[PDB]
């Protein structure tokens, strides 16, 4: 944890807290200079609370003195912490101007607002003056730079505590906080810079929750040895589709192939299985004879036989949710001694007892609506709830990939956040591609957690490479972009 990293750095390593506070403020100044160019033309309004976030603000304000056109600090707190007091005292000795009353029109005479009111010490809702001032800053159209986290964002959840500052730039210290990563906070954060302010690198690295980065995904990508054959790159079985949902299998299957899997087999009710090969004849699409266009227990043995020859099985996209599908999915997963990727309708009928009793690994890929149904809570209680995700992964021995604009991937010990992608992925078909990608990377030798990490990243990055407006992106275009995403990764 990061506030415990500050403490250790001060208390055990012996770095004066004033030194850390200085480094924080100057980082803010350099970050603004990098974003705004020469600062000397700009007039700055620094809004400072009475805590250490405000102390960081006093450092910023003092270091702009005599270099920029004008600086004014509006001090909004009651008491000052010792480091804030020290730095307030420096600002004044340096000739700085402070006021304690905020006049609505004061924004008119400034170009940049530095928001140092509340950082990680925010507790409860912002009300009264603090709130009226945040609302005025938000209506003002000025350039806003938030110190640490925008004021009003809960740094552990990304939730807005009644009201919050919308920043163009946020400079944070040590590591990104969860509140910069999850929405709405990610939105309010604007452009995020992470500054090194002198914490020991060992401590910064012992942080157990990470953003998935290009470097991390590059080093997880499996090797392609030249002397290889299709079996080197594994075999996937996808169990999917129904008479109602004939497209899902094709998108999942090509997801596996486009990430480099050697062989992909679909098991799909006849005659919907022919849809896949008419579009992509590289796929093997096995006809399953069903009574009414859905998988049922009558197909259990055929699907277990098809599983013997593969490395991983993906199940769920387009299966339909009725009782015969439920019987089949749960009896299948109960007997399949292969890694399983469980998506969509296989999640909706899943009995979680089945996951506990399985020797083999599983990845579950729900959206919040599916996760809500699965644990019997509301969407609002599960959305971006990474602790619930961790608990669930740990209890059921699986990897959980909880999909949203920020996707959470956890196995219970390690939790990762993905921030690639755009709103083009908020469209049917896009989850089916991801399920294939995951199965594909598992087939190639990646562990389930590694497979999930690499896939969520590349799936989002592929979407960003679409040439036209993102809202026109479809799952087929996304498939086409996957090999470009992989190439750009290296």
């Amino acid at each position: 944890h990061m506030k415990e990293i500050d403490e250790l750095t001060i208390k055990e390593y012996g770095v004066d807290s004033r030194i850390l506070m200085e480094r924080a403020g100057i980082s803010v100044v350099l970050a603004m200079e990098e974003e705004l160019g020469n600062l000397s033309d700009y007039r700055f309004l620094v809004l400072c609370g009475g805590g250490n976030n405000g102390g960081d603000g006093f450092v910023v304000a003092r270091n702009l003195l005599g270099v920029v056109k004008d600086v004014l600090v509006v001090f909004l707190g009651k008491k000052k912490t010792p480091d804030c007091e020290y730095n307030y005292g420096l600002y004044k000795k340096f000739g700085g101007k402070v006021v304690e009353q905020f006049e609505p029109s004061i924004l008119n005479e400034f170009d940049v607002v530095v928001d140092a009111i509340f950082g990680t010490g925010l507790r409860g809702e912002i009300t009264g003056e603090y709130a009226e001032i945040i609302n005025l800053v938000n209506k003002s159209g000025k350039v806003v730079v938030s110190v640490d986290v925008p004021s009003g964002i809960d740094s552990n959840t990304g939730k807005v505590l009644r009201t919050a500052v919308k920043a163009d730039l946020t400079v944070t210290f040590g590591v990104p906080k969860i509140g910069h990563i999850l929405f709405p906070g990610r939105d309010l954060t604007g452009k995020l810079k992470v500054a090194n302010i002198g914490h020991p690198v060992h401590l910064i690295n012992s942080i157990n929750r990470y953003v998935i980065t290009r470097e991390m995904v590059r080093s997880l990508l499996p090797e392609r040895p030249r002397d290889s054959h299709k079996g080197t790159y594994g075999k996937v079985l996808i169990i999917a589709g129904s008479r109602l949902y004939s497209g899902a299998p094709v998108l999942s299957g090509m997801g596996s192939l486009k990430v480099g899997t050697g062989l992909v087999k679909l098991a799909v009710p006849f005659p919907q299985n022919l849809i896949a090969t008419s579009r992509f004849p590289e796929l093997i699409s096995v006809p399953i004879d069903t009574e009414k266009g859905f998988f049922s227990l009558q197909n259990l043995q055929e699907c277990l036989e098809l599983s013997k020859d593969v490395d991983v099985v993906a199940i769920g996209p387009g299966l339909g949710n009725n009782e015969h599908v439920r019987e089949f999915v749960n009896e299948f997963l109960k007997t399949l001694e292969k890694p399983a990727v469980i998506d969509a309708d296989a999640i909706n009928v899943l009995d979680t007892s089945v996951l506990k009793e399985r020797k083999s690994p599983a990845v579950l890929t729900p959206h919040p609506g599916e996760m809500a149904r699965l644990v019997k809570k509301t969407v609002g209680d599960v959305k971006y709830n990474y602790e619930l995700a961790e608990e669930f992964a740990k209890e059921n021995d699986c990897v959980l990939v909880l999909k949203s604009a920020t996707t959470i991937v956890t196995d219970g010990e390690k939790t990762l956040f993905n921030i690639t992608g755009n709103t083009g992925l908020s469209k049917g078909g896009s989850g089916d591609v991801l399920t294939g990608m995951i199965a594909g990377f598992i087939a190639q030798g990646l562990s389930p957690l590694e497979a999930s990490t690499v896939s969520v990243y590349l799936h989002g990055f592929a979407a960003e490479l679409f040439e036209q407006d993102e809202r026109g992106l479809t799952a087929s275009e996304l498939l086409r972009l996957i090999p470009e995403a992989i190439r750009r990764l290296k």
Partner: peptide, 7 residues
Amino acid sequence: AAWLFEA
């Protein structure tokens, strides 16, 4: 060029 900042 990354001693101070990560993007």
